[PDB]
Amino acid sequence: EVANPEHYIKHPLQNRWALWFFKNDKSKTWQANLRLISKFDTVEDFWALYNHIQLSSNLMPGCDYSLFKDGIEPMWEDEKNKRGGRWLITLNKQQRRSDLDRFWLETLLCLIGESFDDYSDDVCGAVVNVRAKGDKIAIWTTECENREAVTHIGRVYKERLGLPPKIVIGYQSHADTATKSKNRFVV
């Protein structure tokens, strides 16, 4: 006597995500430049979000997007972030053209579609940096000492972007990034 959900039910993601924007407006404190766009926990709502906002390639230099599981703030300071690190994809300025938007989207669909299976717990979120000096996309993991997790994650990622095995990508811990110029792991 009830309706068959398939038709009218939204498709719930395994997690609620929060999309954040950072605009480099040099006359404000960094923490205050970072602002929450919106949150979503369903497939339909993700596409509503993605489609109504600018492609990463059309953001001006010094701006960022990032997507984090709800309750993880997208900064080193977060409880789930302080012991962690990231897989860094350094894109040059010719890959802003052919790669950026599809690397970022693939990243988004990796997070919310939980492509890391078991390891999906160690995932916190991801960041795309638009810079004049060449762009960045990073995946944040929770613990920079879970080698089995960190490296399987980084390897599924590399594969999921379609990167050839010539290209190596490195994982830096947050404590190193936050204090320094170097990779804990490479794939």
Ligand SMILES: CNc1nc2nc(-c3ccc(P(=O)(O)O)cc3)n(CCOc3ccc(Cl)cc3)c2c(=O)[nH]1
């Ligand atoms: C003490 N508070 C604090 N300051 C920070 N400064 C950075 C940071 C890291 C790298 C670069 P770069 O690529 O220009 O070299 C610039 C700044 N971060 C890391 C997060 O960055 C994010 C940027 C944008 C978004 Cl949408 C999310 C995170 C933090 C942070 O986590 N906490």
